[PDB]
Design a binder for this molecule. Structure first.
Ligand SMILES: Nc1ncnc2c1ncn2[C@@H]1O[C@H](COP(=O)(O)OP(=O)(O)O)[C@@H](O)[C@H]1O
Ligand SMILES: Nc1ncnc2c1ncn2[C@@H]1O[C@H](COP(=O)(O)OP(=O)(O)O)[C@@H](O)[C@H]1O
Ligand SMILES: Nc1ncnc2c1ncn2[C@@H]1O[C@H](COP(=O)(O)OP(=O)(O)O)[C@@H](O)[C@H]1O
Ligand SMILES: Nc1ncnc2c1ncn2[C@@H]1O[C@H](COP(=O)(O)OP(=O)(O)O)[C@@H](O)[C@H]1O
Ligand SMILES: [Mg+2]
Ligand SMILES: [Mg+2]
Ligand SMILES: [Mg+2]
Ligand SMILES: [Mg+2]
Lengths: 374, 374, 374, 374
């Protein structure tokens, strides 16, 4: 199938994941950022470009201002998005996006103008023969290898759930939540100031993100952990900064991820992640709820904290009735489960009849996308 | 007689009963329902059919809308009936309906178009060599082993009686009644709302039907039972739903089956089951009434409530004169007595001359059925 | 009759309506909500209470979480209900509920524990000399001035019908439906997200409710309206939210009220409002159906959409036979017809003998209500 | 004669006929029914009575249960009969039954207790100065204007014949028959079910009675009519029910009245109407039979079917010898011939000496009636 070799490209709120259908791991993973210089140059003939995309911006991050083209899964800057797509197709995968149909992903309940503009850029700036837009949670269930269960996806901008029974989706039970990794990073920056550490710039935000994902964990019991931390001092680890200085973090290690289960720490009116998952189940039919309780799939980077699965099981068992058995299925490769399911779907023989052709778009205007792709 | 092996197939308002002549129990019993999907599928290549018949629909009943092809013993949907017959003949009995003559049953006082269409489907869609239509109450008396007595049959849609003296039927004394299991199920659903339990969907109707047939009974004295139930609390049982919740039922246990003897609870103008049985006897000749009083046969699923026979004896003795002796004959296998009598009749040597041939139908149009079969 | 001056107090799923018998309009109408603070106070001596009831909660709705004490006509919080009753009797009507008998209303087919607890609170917390519970649909027919016809009532939680012939009720024909204003509000919130507007909090729900009741209408023909809306742009209106921002609504103006006639939009198994009204008529006797077809009374807030009466007439004429004449009677004051009928009934001279006395709930108890009041 | 103004009141099994002697037509004709409410009233002060008599019951027949006080010419309910007599004397004729002697009618071969109780009610509850009981068939011959011939009377409960020669009655030749309009109505209801129309309630019985008397007729040759009806479709008429529906009747138009000549359709052992009339003639003397063959008088409502006279002539000619001439005398006003003859008899000058006085009853107990009035 080289001819098609569907270039499976995912663009998560925080990262970009591209590759080829049939493989078991993404070829390219890099941050979705665009940087621009903020000082005046004195060296002449240095070959200073006007923009840097991806890992190059993270390297020389001390002299640029970094901007995220995507906020909360909604595009706000379209010039920056075109720059990122050009980087992925030419300088990273080094392929020609004119003979490979492309499969894209999108969160549920997005504005319709998003998919209209996605199709227009792909068919006009590039000449891709076909395209299809799929819900990211459905692709996660493909990777899990099962056709029954409620899926949780939490990336960098959005958190959504969708339960589907024997291949049948219940669109009235889909719930969305605007709590993800970026809110946790801002909260950790705010609460690190009690010990005297002040991080304000965008470059300092990247430093704080690294600290969070290497030293934080979810506590099984929140109140009891505080008493142990207050009494002794064994719950302390040291981190060295990019310039060589040392910081020590105590109860902030588990106080930051706790915001997922108690959103009132940030002052937003919303339910916790455990209650949202339970609320989606209770919106389904009576006769299918038992199979949903025993098939729960976790996905996304924000679900990779240590000890999250045990805490989730404890909370849901307290909510659900005693007789039912609750099982949380968190495979070790759940960080890339969305991409894995996309490759499997594009390699199916029966899927080849649902591509959107170039001819159909030319005759009927850029709306076919809303009715098509289900 | 394998050659004939009459495929004895009964199609009661609620259930379907098929098998072979000469056996003592039906081979296949399953609900007479057809289900169709009501959501939109997202999983591809799942092998999702467009219709489910029988036990398959009851399994996955949480995503379909269930329809009954038969209401009150009168056919309303003919495509669904053809689907059910195809299921029984091929996927359940796994026989070829081309060399076995078929015996069907029908309630008295039905529209004539019913038997005309039954014959046309059997002779055109299938190629059955012969067929015969028998009254279900007559077959019940065959199973009882006697040729004198008044038979009561109450299934899911209709209730009828027919008294026959020494092999002679009195067609002027046949009485019909539109009160059966479905009316009781609707009444129980309506009266369960006083305690806060709300069942509305068709799937919830199946749940309510199971509750009714496992926890309900007929009270010997209606007024006295209410005083005992009001005073104490020993008349209470617990039931667990399909999803782990628990309901408690008090006086609703015996208030639901009571509607058979007092039809005014549903607001319909009609007599009770005891008065209907007595009314049929008084329409017969004087000299045969004494043998009818001492030979009463009960049949059908709705007559399977505990304590129904004792209550029936008490009511009829109060109506009939003191000198006569009233005996109610309710064998333990009366749930299948209609099917049992059909097998016995089809295995009789003297019955083989009354089959309707294929040749007679072809020459004389589909009306022979009305004059034939008595 | 000042002495009695029956305090006519109605408590609809969404609003509360109180006043005095003999008047032509309710004195007090205000939302049935209770609010509680959700932030921590820093100003000292501000006189900050712990709860707000009614219009005070709607004023300062930006810092509280609002809860509805009534869901689907069934009480769930009893402390909040006592708070609301205290507000109405003292701070709004400014009367003493000890010398005026009180008339309350209730939807049919409610749990019996509801009226038991209503009587206990009124006779113990307050010392009201007498009380009576009436069906809201019967009171609506009193206001219409006629004693023949089928009444439709649709408020905020329930929709019910009850046909009554010459003062005789047919309790076997009463039908209930759980589709009202709250389901429409949730659906409009869900379907407003396609244009990018996201309302999630409870305060944002009140904003969405105002938009719905000032810019929505029922289309005479659903399919044809979509073609006109797709082609031109004249079907668009602007609304200005509380911070100065403006939103534009297109086909969502008539897509929201359409859910009443096609309940499958919300994914619930039920019939439309037109089919429910027709189904109730066909459950009545043959000889009284002709007078019911020409006497149809609409009531409740949800029936106040523009163009609802014309659409209802078209649907029922297509269902009913051609010879009958269908007339829909929708008076301009049908928003308060339930309250109007209650005042008329309490002012009748022949009604004074059916009050429930105080000595009877001390010689009988709070169950007298089930047998009494019909 | 105003003073006497004999209030000629007839009470046929089905209808009541009252008026004044000397007139040529009854003043009041209305059904002999009593209705009672069967539902519970909610409207207060509606002036709902506990019983309705006559045309008022037929108007509001959709909410009552109707009972006939008379079955087969024998009184069974005496409270209902007193109610009907009170209605006729006060609310319809508006006269005082204390100064007008009353003439009543009765079928032959009734129980003696009937006339004993009739006299007691009239002399005690009312104070009528005089009474007389006459055979209805004798009064029919008075209206015909002849004193020779055999009279046939068929009303709603009984059919009787009595031949009288030159003013001399032959009481040994009187024959009675229990086949009248009510049996025909029940048979039509039973045989209408073959086309799918189900009428069961008492109100539905009145609908069926109207259909029978407006679309039924007697066929001259029964077998030949069936062949014509089977072949073509011109023998079909349409009728519109009260709620808008439309029913079509084919061979049931003449199959219902045929039961008069072939009583075996209802399964009763009896002779046909033609054979009963012939049997009465053959029980008379030889020398008076010739004048009886040429003087046959028909009377009653059941004899009003079209084509009955021609069929009767054909059957009797086949039975009687060829030389005799058979003439059937059916005047156009034979529906009221019994009442007409009663007025003529009460206006005769020579009849005034045969009244039963009030004084004779007081001295000699209520038996004088059996020996008196012949
Ligand atoms: N080891 C880890 N521990 C905790 N959080 C992590 C870890 N690795 C990644 N994350 C979180 O996952 C997020 C990245 O999600 P990503 O896979 O980019 O989602 P998407 O591709 O949909 O944008 C980061 O914001 C980071 O906070
Ligand atoms: N154990 C039981 N207790 C009470 N009711 C029962 C029981 N078993 C069956 N029934 C009733 O009998 C009905 C089934 O009747 P069925 O035998 O199908 O009649 P038919 O074959 O004529 O349709 C069901 O509707 C059910 O309500
Ligand atoms: N002008 C309007 N247009 C559309 N909907 C309205 C309008 N006015 C009121 N409503 C709806 O009617 C409902 C109020 O019903 P209400 O009269 O309180 O019933 P009840 O008294 O039984 O609670 C509100 O939820 C609102 O959505
Ligand atoms: N036009 C008609 N065709 C057929 N039957 C009729 C017609 N008119 C009246 N009848 C029958 O005659 C009966 C009325 O008989 P009626 O004169 O009341 O006898 P009586 O006065 O002795 O009760 C009704 O039951 C009805 O069935
Ligand atoms: Mg993700
Ligand atoms: Mg049965
Ligand atoms: Mg209302
Ligand atoms: Mg008569």
């Amino acid at each position: 199938d080289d001819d098609i070799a569907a270039l499976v490209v995912d663009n998560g709120s925080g990262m970009c994941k591209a590759g080829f259908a049939g493989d078991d791991a993404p070829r390219a993973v890099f941050p979705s950022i665009v940087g621009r210089p903020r000082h005046q140059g004195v060296m002449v003939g240095m070959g200073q470009k006007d923009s840097y995309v991806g890992d190059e911006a993270q390297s020389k991050r001390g002299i640029l201002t970094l901007k995220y083209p995507i906020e909360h899964g909604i595009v706000t800057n379209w010039d920056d998005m075109e720059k990122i797509w050009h980087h992925t197709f030419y300088n990273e995968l080094r392929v020609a996006p004119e003979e490979h149909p492309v499969l894209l992903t999108e969160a549920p309940l997005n504005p319709k103008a998003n998919r209209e503009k996605m199709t227009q850029i792909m068919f006009e700036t590039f000449n891709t023969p076909a395209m299809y837009v799929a819900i990211q949670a459905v692709l996660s269930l493909y990777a899990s290898g099962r056709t029954t269960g409620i899926v949780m996806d939490s990336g960098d901008g959005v958190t959504h759930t969708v339960p589907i029974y024997e291949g049948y989706a219940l669109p009235h039970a889909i719930l969305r939540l605007d709590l993800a990794g970026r809110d946790l990073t801002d909260y950790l920056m705010k609460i690190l100031t009690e010990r005297g550490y002040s991080f304000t710039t965008t470059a300092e935000r990247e430093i704080v993100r690294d600290i969070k994902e290497k030293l934080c964990y979810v506590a099984l019991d929140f109140e009891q952990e505080m008493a142990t931390a207050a009494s002794s001092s064994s719950l302390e680890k040291s981190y060295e900064l990019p310039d060589g200085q040392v910081i020590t973090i105590g109860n902030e290690r588990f106080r930051c991820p706790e915001a997922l289960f108690q959103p009132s720490f940030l002052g937003m009116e919303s339910c916790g992640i455990h209650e949202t998952t339970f609320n989606s189940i209770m919106k389904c039919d009576v006769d299918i709820r038992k199979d949903l309780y025993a098939n729960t799939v976790l996905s996304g980077g924000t679900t990779m904290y240590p000890g999250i699965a045990d805490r989730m099981q404890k909370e849901i068992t307290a909510l659900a009735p005693s007789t039912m058995k609750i099982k949380i299925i968190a495979p070790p490769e759940r960080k890339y489960s969305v991409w894995i399911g996309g490759s499997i779907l594009a390699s199916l023989s029966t899927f080849q009849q649902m591509w959107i052709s170039k001819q159909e778009y030319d005759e009927s205007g850029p709306s076919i996308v809303h009715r098509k792709c289900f």
